[PDB]
Design a protein around this motif. Structure first.
Motif, PDB file in Angstrom:
ATOM      1  N   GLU A   1     -47.276  -1.484 -10.484  1.00  7.62           N
ATOM      2  CA  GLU A   1     -45.940  -2.069 -10.471  1.00  7.62           C
ATOM      3  C   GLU A   1     -45.234  -1.804  -9.149  1.00  7.62           C
ATOM      4  O   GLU A   1     -44.611  -2.706  -8.584  1.00  7.62           O
ATOM      5  N   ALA A   2     -45.329  -0.575  -8.636  1.00 12.92           N
ATOM      6  CA  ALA A   2     -44.731  -0.260  -7.343  1.00 12.92           C
ATOM      7  C   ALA A   2     -45.336  -1.103  -6.232  1.00 12.92           C
ATOM      8  O   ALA A   2     -44.633  -1.517  -5.305  1.00 12.92           O
ATOM      9  N   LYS A   3     -46.645  -1.357  -6.302  1.00 15.29           N
ATOM     10  CA  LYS A   3     -47.270  -2.214  -5.299  1.00 15.29           C
ATOM     11  C   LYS A   3     -46.760  -3.645  -5.386  1.00 15.29           C
ATOM     12  O   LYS A   3     -46.665  -4.329  -4.360  1.00 15.29           O
ATOM     13  N   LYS A   4     -46.452  -4.125  -6.592  1.00 23.43           N
ATOM     14  CA  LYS A   4     -45.805  -5.432  -6.706  1.00 23.43           C
ATOM     15  C   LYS A   4     -44.398  -5.402  -6.116  1.00 23.43           C
ATOM     16  O   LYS A   4     -44.039  -6.250  -5.292  1.00 23.43           O
ATOM     17  N   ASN A   5     -43.592  -4.420  -6.526  1.00 20.67           N
ATOM     18  CA  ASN A   5     -42.207  -4.324  -6.075  1.00 20.67           C
ATOM     19  C   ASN A   5     -42.111  -4.166  -4.565  1.00 20.67           C
ATOM     20  O   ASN A   5     -41.158  -4.655  -3.949  1.00 20.67           O
ATOM     21  N   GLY A   6     -43.079  -3.487  -3.955  1.00 21.10           N
ATOM     22  CA  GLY A   6     -43.036  -3.188  -2.542  1.00 21.10           C
ATOM     23  C   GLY A   6     -42.610  -1.780  -2.193  1.00 21.10           C
ATOM     24  O   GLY A   6     -42.591  -1.438  -1.004  1.00 21.10           O
ATOM     25  N   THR A   7     -42.265  -0.951  -3.182  1.00 22.13           N
ATOM     26  CA  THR A   7     -41.888   0.425  -2.879  1.00 22.13           C
ATOM     27  C   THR A   7     -43.063   1.205  -2.302  1.00 22.13           C
ATOM     28  O   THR A   7     -42.886   2.018  -1.389  1.00 22.13           O
TER      29      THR A   7
ATOM     30  N   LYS B   1     -43.166   9.434  -2.118  1.00 24.45           N
ATOM     31  CA  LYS B   1     -42.251   8.444  -1.565  1.00 24.45           C
ATOM     32  C   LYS B   1     -40.825   8.668  -2.056  1.00 24.45           C
ATOM     33  O   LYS B   1     -39.873   8.610  -1.264  1.00 24.45           O
TER      34      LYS B   1
END
Ligand SMILES: CCCCCCCCCCCCCCCCCC(=O)OC[C@H](COP(=O)([O-])OCC(O)COP(=O)([O-])OC[C@@H](COC(=O)CCCCCCCCCCCCCCCCC)OC(=O)CCCCCCCCCCCCCCCCC)OC(=O)CCCCCCCCCCCCCCCCC
Ligand SMILES: CCCCCCCCCCCC(=O)OC[C@H](COP(=O)(O)OCC[N+](C)(C)C)OC(=O)CCCCCCCCCCC
Ligand SMILES: CCCCCCCCCCCC(=O)OC[C@H](COP(=O)(O)OCC[N+](C)(C)C)OC(=O)CCCCCCCCCCC
Lengths: 171, 61
Positions: A164-170, A119
């Motif tokens: 953490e990325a799944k929380k952030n939305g990235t 990504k």
């Protein structure tokens, strides 16, 4: 070429390159970072790699000494892509190759880090990972969810960063 | 006479078991054959799926 047999010694050559030959930088990545970057290097440097190989074939035996300028282009393109990765996506790239160092260099053991790396590299370098030669029916394995083959221990830092990325939305 | 002699009980002892007692146990044989077929078929499903995914990993490498 075969590996060396019964008794052999390694020997280093102390000469310099002949001064007629233009100097070039050498790639400084080791095996794990290179394997991590290989698909992006392929994506960007395909024309130069193809030209280098075509020159070597056409030289019909003198390829080393006849394609040095093509080889210079190939190595410069590889250095450029690795520099771009080091400037924009270093944390995720390091995640991926450290995971590879723990998993016998098997990409199947590092899918979570690779998702972040892909990504990042796509968003900031416009390079895409793609497996040549598949039909539209066939699914690339790195995109597969719920694979048969999984790592023994999902990498700790990679698991945390992925969540953490799944929380952030990235991701 | 007879005083203090070891003697049997007035009613006798309850009968003991002396005939062969080896009762048949287990499902019929075809049940075991069917279970073996199912186990092997499921294992083959998994093993061939694993082989195919391993080949795709080989392509990526
Ligand atoms: C195809 C035909 C399908 C026909 C059908 O529907 O039968 C159903 C069948 C019952 O019908 P049945 O053949 O007439 O058996 C009834 C008898 O009473 C048989 O029951 P049982 O009380 O005489 O004994 C059952 C016991 C047989 O063994 C024993 O009797 C004691 C074993 C102790 C196990 C210790 C562990 O089961 C086993 O332990 C066999 C597995 C041996 C390794 C474990 O039930 C099953 O399908 C169960 C299948 C389980 C497969 C396990 C094999 C591996
Ligand atoms: C360490 C863990 C303990 C393991 C010890 C093994 C216990 C086995 C118990 C005896 C079962 C049996 O022998 O069943 C006997 C049956 C035969 O039944 P039948 O005579 O035709 O009955 C007919 C009359 N009926 C049906 C009306 C009742 O066999 C078979 O057809 C196939 C053989 C299956 C046994 C395979 C054993 C697998 C174990 C592997 C681990
Ligand atoms: C003589 C042997 C005849 C057996 C015929 C059985 C066919 C039953 C249909 C189920 C198949 C299926 O639908 O599952 C497909 C599976 C797994 O592939 P997949 O990744 O899930 O599919 C996706 C296709 N991709 C990968 C291209 C995306 O393929 C198999 O190999 C499992 C077959 C079942 C095991 C049969 C072995 C029989 C025992 C052999 C002992 C000598």
């Amino acid at each position: 070429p075969r590996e060396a047999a019964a008794h052999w010694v390694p020997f280093e050559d102390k000469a310099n390159m002949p001064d007629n030959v233009p100097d070039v930088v050498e790639v400084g990545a080791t095996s794990a970072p290179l394997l991590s970057a290989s698909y992006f290097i392929g994506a960007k440097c395909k024309p130069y790699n193809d030209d280098f190989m075509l020159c070597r074939e056409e030289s019909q035996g003198s390829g080393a000494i006849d394609c040095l300028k093509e080889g210079r282009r190939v190595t410069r393109c590889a250095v450029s892509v690795i520099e771009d990765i080091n400037k924009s996506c270093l944390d995720e790239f390091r995640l991926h190759w450290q995971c590879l160092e723990q998993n016998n260099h098997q990409l199947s053991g590092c899918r979570k880090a690779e998702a972040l790396l892909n990504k990042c590299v796509f968003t900031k370098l416009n390079l895409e990972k793609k497996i040549p030669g598949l039909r539209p029916d066939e699914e690339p394995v790195f995109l597969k969810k719920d694979p048969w083959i999984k790592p023994a221990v999902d990498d700790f830092k990679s698991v945390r960063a992925y969540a953490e990325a799944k929380k952030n939305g990235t991701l | 006479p007879s005083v203090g002699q070891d003697l049997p009980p007035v009613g006798g002892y309850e009968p003991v078991q002396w005939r062969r007692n080896l009762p048949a146990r287990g499902f019929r044989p075809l049940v075991y054959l069917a279970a073996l077929c199912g186990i092997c078929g499921y294992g083959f499903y998994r093993a061939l799926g694993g082989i195919q995914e391993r080949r795709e990993l080989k392509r990526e490498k």
